Amino acid sequence: NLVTPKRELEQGVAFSDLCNFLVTPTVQGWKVYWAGLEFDVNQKGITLLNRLKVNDFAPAWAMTRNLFPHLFKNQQSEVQTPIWALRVILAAGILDQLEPLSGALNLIADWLLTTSTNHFNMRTQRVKDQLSMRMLSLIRSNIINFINKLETLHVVNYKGLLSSVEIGTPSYAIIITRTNMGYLVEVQEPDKSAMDIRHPGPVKFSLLHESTLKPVAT
């Protein structure tokens, strides 16, 4: 034996911080706390995305509607909560640079991204055995790095400066675009079937106001 393990506390804390997605209401909107990271989410942008979807006549929004027709002119797109937008971004932060942790990490990301449950029921006892300060630290570091990358994006522009990132996996495609309001977040099927003009596939999307990630960037 090289080092005596004393891991109960460690595993208890990692389990708590990784497997509980904490949301509480605040005056502005909601505070979210996950993996020891704190985010203030507000309502800004939601009503705009909703109005934007309606097939009414509005020349002022013609360009935006025509820029993202798969979001704004599509009966199968659905606006989600800003909480959802944050969950997608956290998952993307895990997947972005994604050896034994991989499995577990993926699980956590899939939980964040494909469900709205606040507790993550571990699939197997072995994956649960994976929970550690090291896994938590890796996850936080990944998320911070991805937030920093996001903060380098330019708003949609006419000059060819990067304005979006895309994360692909076999189960889904994530696209995150910097707009004047914040991060436009979308999840489409892996083949990106929402992008097909003749029959636009289903797509979930929302907006995370730019106030939310700023303070967590380093």
Residue numbers in the entry: 9 to 106, 113 to 232
Which lines from the publication concern this structure?
VP24, one of only eight proteins encoded by ebolaviruses, functions in virus replication and assembly, and is thought to contribute to immune suppression by binding to a certain class of molecules called karyopherins to prevent them from transporting a transcription factor termed STAT1. In addition to its role in interferon antagonism, ebolavirus VP24 has also been proposed to associate with membranes, and is important for assembly and function of the viral ribonucleoprotein complex (RNP), where VP24 binds to the viral nucleoprotein NP. VP24 adopts a compact, single domain, α/β structure of novel fold (DaliLite v.3). The overall shape of VP24 resembles a triangular pyramid of dimensions 73 Å×30 Å×30 Å.
In order to provide 3D templates for understanding VP24 and its many roles in immune evasion, replication and assembly, we crystallized VP24 from Sudan virus (two versions crystallized: SUDV1–233 and SUDV11–233) and Reston virus (one version crystallized: RESTV11–237). We subsequently determined structures of SUDV1–233 and RESTV11–237 by molecular replacement, both at 2.0 Å resolution. Crystal structures presented here include VP24 from an ebolavirus that is pathogenic to humans (Sudan virus; SUDV) and VP24 from an ebolavirus that thus far, appears nonpathogenic to humans (Reston virus; RESTV), although it is lethal to nonhuman primates. The overall folds of SUDV and RESTV VP24 are similar, as expected (r.m.s.d. of 0.81 Å; also see Figure S2b for structural alignment). The entrance to the hydrophobic cavity (11 Å wide) appears to be gated by two residues (Y172 and M71) that point away from each other in RESTV VP24 but toward each other in SUDV VP24, appearing to block the hydrophobic cavity. Crystal packing can sometimes illustrate biologically relevant assemblies, but no tetrameric or other higher oligomeric interactions are observed in crystals of SUDV or RESTV VP24. One pairwise VP24-VP24 interaction is conserved in the crystal packing between the SUDV (P3121) and RESTV VP24 (P1211) structures, although it is currently unclear if it is biologically relevant. This interaction involves α1, β1–3 and the N-terminal region of α8, and buries residue L147 that was previously implicated for virulence, although 142–146 remain solvent exposed. Another crystal lattice interaction observed in both RESTV and SUDV structures involves packing of the hydrophobic N-terminal regions of VP24 into the Face 3 pocket of a neighboring molecule.
